[PDB]
Amino acid sequence: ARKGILGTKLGMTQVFDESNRVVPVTVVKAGPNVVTRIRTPERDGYSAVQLAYGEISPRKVNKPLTGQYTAAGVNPRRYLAELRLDDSDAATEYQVGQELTAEIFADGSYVDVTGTSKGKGFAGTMKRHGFRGQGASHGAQAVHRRPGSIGGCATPARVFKGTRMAGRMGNDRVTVLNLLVHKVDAENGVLLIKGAVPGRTGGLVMVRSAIKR
Amino acid sequence: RIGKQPIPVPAGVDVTIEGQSISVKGPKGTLGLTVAEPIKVARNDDGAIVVTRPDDERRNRSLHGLSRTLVSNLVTGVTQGYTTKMEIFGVGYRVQLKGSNLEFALGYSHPVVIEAPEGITFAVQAPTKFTVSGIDKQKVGQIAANIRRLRRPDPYKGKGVRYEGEQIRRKVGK
Amino acid sequence: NAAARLNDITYNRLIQGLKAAGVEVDRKNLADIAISDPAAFTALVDVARAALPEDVNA
């Protein structure tokens, strides 16, 4: 039931629908994928399928990975990821070496898009966690963006684990739910997905048929 | 006193006893049962059922009548099943039989449908009277109670689903 | 205790029985025997059991 594809975020644009309403879309080049591997419950303990996406010079792949691809009889690709299926294999619907193109999805369906969000570096509490800070005037001394108190007093004489402080922000795995597929352009292998998609332009993206729908 | 009575066997076609277990079949289907440990199920002079236990313990005097009446109900239901008659009151409240299930009109925006499980058969007589039938007394009572509680009690007008011959409470209100 | 329970007797009754039999070896050497000469320890356990009273709850 669960359908998946791997692609690249190509940036956003806008289109007008039939109601003459503007629709902001993200162009995802859901390029062709190869299966390259099937996980069976009998052999691995769960049911899933690998997917190979992206072109790469064969000289850029080391001998072990090249051997893994040769075992599947497929030319090496840049990326490799597993699509997890329900705990029932059904022992069907996928063959090693089979091609997956963009029209596994249809117009008007909903998808889940997971990617790697943009990095923000070391971030303060005001950006990272939406703290308020103290005022800009009325005597405040060098605390305009500082966090304030971080605990109680002699009880407990510690800071609780999971207290929100400054640190590295971004580069996370992020899934956006219930995105409407506005158009499936099978000619260019392009999905026009209404909304925003995590990550930078040119980053690896996994598109899955939505489960909440 | 209950439990100090033999259980007569009208048919009891396949009365079987296997380690405090029993099965009885007859004019209707079969029904099984497992008897509690300190209770002994044995035969009478006339093929009837009797139960016994070591005398004068609280936990055994309690289990005696229970284990007696359970097998009595089982054999009675095997001979002739149990049926419960239920009425419907209130203007516009009515019932119809839809295949194996049974539909209710009880003033809700949607209709209410009750599916009959295995061993239970519904039967409508009038648009406001019906009957639930079966062999297992507990199961018949359970289904009847589920149907009974379909509407919250109404002491003022009296609308809803009742048992036959039961007298609900009434209040005047306004 | 380990050696006695291996020979099917509690330390409790073994000590009672050895005192009843009038054996005056101390615990250091009893443990030494239990490690080194289990046959001798079994003989000692037999002596203690024999000297122990017939009913130990009277």
């Binding site: - | - | 380990a2 007797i9 009754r13």
Partner: protein, 146 residues
């Protein structure tokens, strides 16, 4: 000088304990004693003597109904309000071996030796274990009459 075991004197063996109708406390005491080796006259508190113990049928241990309903298991994650809580009933449904091994581990000395002693314990929910190559002798629980 009293005897002190040397490196290479300790001799291990393999026992299998069946948990069909044993109550949890009795089984845990027996397993802890076998693991530590207190039944060996060569016992020494600073030496990891004792044997390997395989416990099978961990789902058959005799636990009272009120204990399944009411005995409760607590874990704190370290975060505020992070006290999580299960019943012996839920544990017995999901990971029965964890109940047995938690009961056993509570009964061991709280030191560095017990970390190595507990490495010799195997608990299985089903009636079969993978250590057939090792030939574990069966072990029934005895009480010495006094």
């Amino acid at each position: 000088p009293t005897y002190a075991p040397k490196a290479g004197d300790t001799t291990r063996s393999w026992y299998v304990i069946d948990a069909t109708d044993v109550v949890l406390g009795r089984l845990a005491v027996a397993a802890a004693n076998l693991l530590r080796g207190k039944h060996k006259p060569t016992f020494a508190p600073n030496v990891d003597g004792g044997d390997f113990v395989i416990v099978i049928n961990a789902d058959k241990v005799a636990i009272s109904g009120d204990k399944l309903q009411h005995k409760m298991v607590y874990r704190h994650s370290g975060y505020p309000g992070g006290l999580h809580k299960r019943t012996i009933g839920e544990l017995m449904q999901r990971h029965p071996d964890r109940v047995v091994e938690k009961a056993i581990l509570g009964m061991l000395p709280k030191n560095r030796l017990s970390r190595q002693i507990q490495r010799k314990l195997r608990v299985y929910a089903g009636p079969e274990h993978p250590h057939s190559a090792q030939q574990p002798v069966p072990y029934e629980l005895k009480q010495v009459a006094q």
